[PDB]
Amino acid sequence: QEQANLIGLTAEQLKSIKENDVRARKEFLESQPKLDNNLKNIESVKKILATWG
Amino acid sequence: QVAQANYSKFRADYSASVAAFQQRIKTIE
Amino acid sequence: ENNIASNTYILIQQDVANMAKAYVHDICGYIDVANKENVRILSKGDLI
Amino acid sequence: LSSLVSFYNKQHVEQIPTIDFNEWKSVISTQGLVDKVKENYESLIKEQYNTDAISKQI
Incomplete structure (x- = not known):
């Protein structure tokens, strides 16, 4: 019983942990490179950045 | 690791x- | 003789504008290759 | 052109730390959590980039 009594992880308490994992993913994937801004205007590069994911 | x-x-x-060197042999042929 | 806009066949290279422009239009195209791989590997399963 | 080269050729060295799940499993952890993280963690470590496919197309 001490397994749960000592550490009573509530649904919302564990929920916050899961959101951080998801938030870490979206930040890692959606992170796009930061090169020269006003120079990377090619149709191909801008197309890739839009669909970076 | x-x-x-x-x-x-x-x-x-x-x-x-x-291996692209193999492609060069294709041209010779 | 068909697909090069030049006013003469005596080609003289005095600048690398036409050369570097075609390289950035080529090496850049292969961007997102690793990030795209991360999508598949990371979208596979959720750590939690 | 130089930016893309420096961008692609940037070196990454951060001393990827090793995880000792046995240590965390013993000191304190939620039942089934330390093991669930380990099995799920190891699964993603197996996945790796496929350098071969890219090498051919380029």
Whole structure:
């Protein structure tokens, strides 16, 4: 019983942990490179950045 | 351990690129 | 003789504009290759 | 052109730390959590880039 009594992880308490994992993913994937801004205007590069994911 | 995997994959791309030398033989033919 | 806009066949290279422009239009195209791989590997399963 | 080269050729060295799940499993952890993280963690470590496919197309 001490397994749960000592550490009573509530649904919302564990929920916050899961959101951080998801938030870490979206930040890692959606992170796009930061090169020269006003120079990377090619149709191909801008197309890739839009669909970076 | 990831460095070991990095080096192994690193040499793979090298060998795969050097294979382009085979494409040169295609031109000669 | 068909697909090069030049006013003469006596080609004289005095600048690398036409050369570097075609390289950035080529090496850049292969961007997102690793990030795209991360999508598949990371979208596979959720750590939690 | 130089930016893309420096961008692609940037070296990454951060001393990827090793995880000792046995240590965390013993000191304190939620039942089934330390093991669930380990099995799920190890699964993604197996996945790796496929350098071969890219080497051919380029």
